[PDB]
UniProtKB/Swiss-Prot annotation:
Component of the ESCRT-0 complex composed of STAM or STAM2 and HGS. Probably part of a complex at least composed of HSG, STAM and EPS15. Found in a complex with HGS and E3 ligase ITCH and DTX3L. Interacts with E3 ligase DTX3L; the interaction brings together STAM and HSG, promotes their recruitment to early endosomes and decreases STAM and HGS ubiquitination by ITCH. Interacts with STAMBP/AMSH. Interacts with PDGFRB. Interacts with LITAF; the interaction is direct. Identified in a complex with HGS and LITAF. Interacts with HAVCR1. Residues 15-72 form the SH3 domain. The lineage of its organism: Eukaryota, Metazoa, Chordata, Craniata, Vertebrata. The VHS domain mediates high-avidity binding to Lys63-linked and Lys48-linked polyubiquitinated cargos. Belongs to the STAM family. It is found in: Cytoplasm; Early endosome membrane. It comes from Homo sapiens. Ubiquitously expressed. It comes from the Eukaryota. This is Signal transducing adapter molecule 1. Phosphorylated in response to IL2, IL3, IL4, IL7, CSF2/GM-CSF, EGF and PDGFB. Phosphorylated by activated PDGFRB.
């Protein structure tokens, strides 16, 4: 037995999507990476670790581990 399972428990918390502003520019090198320039407002939907953040831009949705950004 054993194939694939993905089931989250009902984690009733204040799931707040937070925003971060870019100070430096970088286009997505990988498909998992995020494409955006300097000054942009990236909505980070899930930051589990300060090493890998998942955010949203109108250029694409992905990760920006370089952390060349600020929080506002």
């Amino acid at each position: 037995m054993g194939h694939h399972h993905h089931h989250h428990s009902h984690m009733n918390h204040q799931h707040e999507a937070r925003k971060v502003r870019a100070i430096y520019d970088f286009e997505a090198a990988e498909d998992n990476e995020l494409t955006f320039k300097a000054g942009e407002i990236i909505t980070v939907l899930d930051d589990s670790d300060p090493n890998w953040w998942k955010g949203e831009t109108h250029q694409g949705i992905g990760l920006f581990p370089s952390n060349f950004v600020t929080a506002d």
